[PDB]
Amino acid sequence: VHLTPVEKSAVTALWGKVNVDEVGGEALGRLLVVYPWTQRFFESFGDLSTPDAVMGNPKVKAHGKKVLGAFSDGLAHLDNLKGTFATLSELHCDKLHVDPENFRLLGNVLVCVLAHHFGKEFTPPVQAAYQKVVAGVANALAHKYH
Amino acid sequence: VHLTPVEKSAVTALWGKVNVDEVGGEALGRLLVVYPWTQRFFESFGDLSTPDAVMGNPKVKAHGKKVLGAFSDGLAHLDNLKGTFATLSELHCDKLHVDPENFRLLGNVLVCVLAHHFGKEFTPPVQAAYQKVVAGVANALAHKYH
Amino acid sequence: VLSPADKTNVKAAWGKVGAHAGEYGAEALERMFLSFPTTKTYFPHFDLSHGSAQVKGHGKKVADALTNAVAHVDDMPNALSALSDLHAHKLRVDPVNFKLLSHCLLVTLAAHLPAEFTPAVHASLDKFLASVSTVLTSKYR
Amino acid sequence: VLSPADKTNVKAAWGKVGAHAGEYGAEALERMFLSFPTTKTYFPHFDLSHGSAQVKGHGKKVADALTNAVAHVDDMPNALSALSDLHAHKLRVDPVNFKLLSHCLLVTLAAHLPAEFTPAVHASLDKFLASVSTVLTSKYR
Ligand code: HEM
Ligand code: HEM
Ligand code: HEM
Ligand code: HEM
Ligand SMILES: *Cc1c(O)cccc1OCc1cccnc1-c1ccnn1C(C)C
Asked: Which ligand is located closest to the Cα atom of residue C131?
């Protein structure tokens, strides 16, 4: 579903306050902790044996930053998520064969992290707008399966 | 969906042997029995209270025939499933709001019914070709969500 | 399947909810209805307006049911049979909707109890809610 | 959560499998590998050619585990703890793959035991395989 203009302003305003060094790493780390099979795609990343080990892993933090940047690209091109994520879709679908349900999971983990950081500022209407974003992103990332 | 020449010939040959009066109704019936929440979408169909009631229900059988006919249309137009199922997708997605996991489930129940009817003739390569087909149909029905 | 550590996390985290149970249950429902509008079709007999007394009251019922589920965490099928009757037999709720409410519950807990919502507790709560969801959507009588 | 009727259906159906359990396990694996080629990524060290003795041997192991699950249907977490360690802790198998194997097992049973594969039994068997899947993909120890 399309974001409304009010929703687009709300998501963008909140996103400007996000800690870009950290939030991506927390989302990726939580994915690896909450859904541990996703660790299979990151065997070269080192120690992922405990929650602390995952969250404090420099490669998880670094790679999370990249994940966050891609979400930032989506927020700047919401009318063209297909185009924006075309390359990433090929990598994740054609090369890595990540099951698409996992893209949905990461999206929702990111939403949980935003709630964690922003508290009562992450209002139900604000969440609803972000659910549209993460759904659009997941869908764009799974495009090669469509 | 892309099938090799031998896959196309294999799926077509099997499909010609399908009992068009029963196979659709058994697939839909089994969906309603195996995944009972799907009954919520069929309140107007009457008695669905037991497996025997579902399988013997005249409306389940009749509607099953229509479902089977859609799969036949899909088989005839494998190169353009998105176009073929455009109006059906609008119905299932925009009007009925059927969660798309259920599309995958019905495709796999159909495959179970084909195995049930054809036995050892439903070989692993034949199944593989049909899994390509039902995945394509499920994806086409879900296109309005993409 | 919850580990012993999972059960300790859920008992601890949900125990910190306390008198805010209904508030959080109501908020999770509101979050679900706004974020995933198709879920509203299960509640045509409810006043779903924002700040509805019926939603606040139902949030309490949902939250109180979870407390019952945590209290009988090793015998949830028996403990929650009435609710399985309701959600699986009567209402025929598509399991996707349970994933949606569970997610909204985690969001609510993360927003309100950020110190408690560690990665490990998040994991355990997600498993607990999935477990409750499986029981409520299964027909086992 | 299996009903008493579900457990009777599973046990009745698995009884008719008999000495063919390994054959069916092998066929389900083969059907999985052909229909869902991404699943082969978990077995890079296996001979996966058609007729592979290794796949036949593995089909027997899988079938034997399911037999053990049938024997311990009310005690699956305890009975299957080593297999959970393997699949959940060590292999980290994505749960979607269990849905694929479970589906291929149903396909195999429908192909071989059509008189046994009633809609009721199909439903019970699907639930049983989902239950086993949940145990093998959870870390609870
Ligand atoms: C849902 C939103 C997701 C976004 C926005 C995203 C974004 C990205 C980006 C930007 C890269 C870097 C590619 C490059 O530098 O060329 C990447 C790599 C990767 N992603 Fe994702 N990703 C997502 C989901 C997933 C999921 C769910 C998984 C696995 C379960 C996954 C596994 C990977 C892997 C394995 C790599 C390559 C890591 C490496 O090079 O060692 N991603 N992703
Ligand atoms: C996956 C492949 C599926 C196919 C090929 C299919 C095909 C069809 C067709 C041809 C119709 C008739 C529409 C018309 O007359 O214009 C229909 C109607 C319908 N389908 Fe499906 N369908 C599928 C999946 C599903 C699923 C999974 C559900 C529910 C869980 C569902 C629920 C319905 C309902 C409720 C109707 C309308 C019945 C009525 O008029 O009362 N369908 N479908
Ligand atoms: C953790 C998940 C859930 C819990 C713990 C839960 C708990 C409850 C409880 C305690 C009730 C009150 C039953 C009574 O009247 O005594 C109830 C009712 C209800 N629940 Fe849920 N529920 C959950 C998920 C869902 C979901 C996902 C839906 C739909 C999307 C749903 C739809 C309903 C409906 C329609 C009622 C109507 C009760 C009435 O007739 O007034 N529930 N639930
Ligand atoms: C009902 C589902 C399943 C059952 C009952 C099952 C059972 C087993 C058993 C009994 C073993 C042998 C343990 C031993 O060596 O003593 C095993 C190994 C294994 N399973 Fe599964 N399994 C299931 C599903 C899966 C799925 C879905 C995958 C991957 C897609 C998978 C991948 C493996 C792998 C890779 C091994 C190790 C093979 C080796 O190195 O020898 N299993 N499984
Ligand atoms: C009962 C069930 C159904 O219907 C589908 C999938 C999984 C199911 O149970 C999993 C299972 C099996 C054995 C022991 N515990 C569990 C489990 C895992 C999470 N919740 N549960 C229930 C408390 C049984």
From this structure: 5
Q: For chain A, how many structural domains are there in total? A: 1
**Distance between CA atoms of D99 and D107, rounded to whole angstroms?**
12
Q: Are C32 and A124 in contact (CB under 8 A)?
A: no
Specify the long-range contacts of residues A17-20, CB closer than 8 Å, at least 24 apart: A17/A118, A18/A68, A18/A114, A18/A117, A19/A117, A20/A65, A20/A68, A20/A72
Rg over alpha carbons for chain A, rounded to the nearest Å, is: 15
Rounded distance between C-alpha atoms, residue A18 and residue B146, angstroms = 28
Q: What angle do CA C109, C115, C118 make, to 5 degrees?
A: 75
CA distances from C136 to C44, C82, C97, D4 (A): 20, 9, 11, 17
Query: How many angstroms separate the Cα of A91 from the Cα of each of A72, B9, C12, D44, D68?
Result: 19, 33, 41, 21, 40
Query: Residue D65: CB within 6 Å of ligand 4?
Result: yes
Question: Chain C interface residues facing chain B, Cβ-Cβ under 8 Å?
Answer: 38, 41, 88, 91-96, 137, 139
Do C32 and C100 contact (CB within 8 A), yes or no?
Answer: yes
Separation CA A110–CA A61 (nearest Å): 14
Do A117 and A68 touch, CB atoms closer than 8 A? no
Cα D77–D83–D89 angle (5° rounding)? 95
Experimental method of this PDB entry: X-ray
Chains within contact range of chain B (3+ C-beta pairs < 8 Å): A, C, D
User: Which residue has 């994740």 as its token pair?
Assistant: A92
Going from the C-alpha of D8 to that of each of A96, C126, D12, D13, D55, the distances in angstroms are 42, 31, 6, 9, 30
Q: How far is the CA of A90 from the centre of ligand 3 (A)?
A: 41
Residues of A marked as binding? Answer: 1-2, 63, 82, 92, 143
C77 contact partners, CB below 8 Å, separation of at least 6? C84, C135, C138, C140, D1
Q: Which of A31, A34, A38, A40 to mutate to test the interface with D (most CBs of D within 10 A)?
A: A40
Contact A119 C123 (CB under 8 A): no
Domains and CATH numbers, chain C: 1-141 (1.10.490.10)
D72 marked as part of a ligand binding site: no
Cα–Cα nearest to C34, from B100, A100, A71, A7: A7
Q: Are C124 and C2 in contact (CB under 8 A)?
A: yes
Cα(D126) to ligand 5 centroid in Å equals 13
Compute the distance between CA of residue C64 and CA of residue C68 in angstroms, rounded to an integer: 6
For residues B143, C96, C139, C86, the Cα torsion angle rounded to the nearest 10 degrees is -120
Local structure of D51: helix, strand or coil: coil
Helix (H) or strand (E) holding D21: helix D21-35
Find the CATH number of the domain harbouring A30: 1.10.490.10
In one-letter notation, the amino acid at residue A35 is Y
- What range defines the domain where residue B136 resides? 1-146
**Ligand nearest to the Cα of C98, by number:** 3
- Please give the helix or strand (H or E) that residue B4 lies within, else none: none
Are the C-beta atoms of D113 and D16 separated by less than 8 Å?
A: yes
Token code pair at residue D119: 């809609």
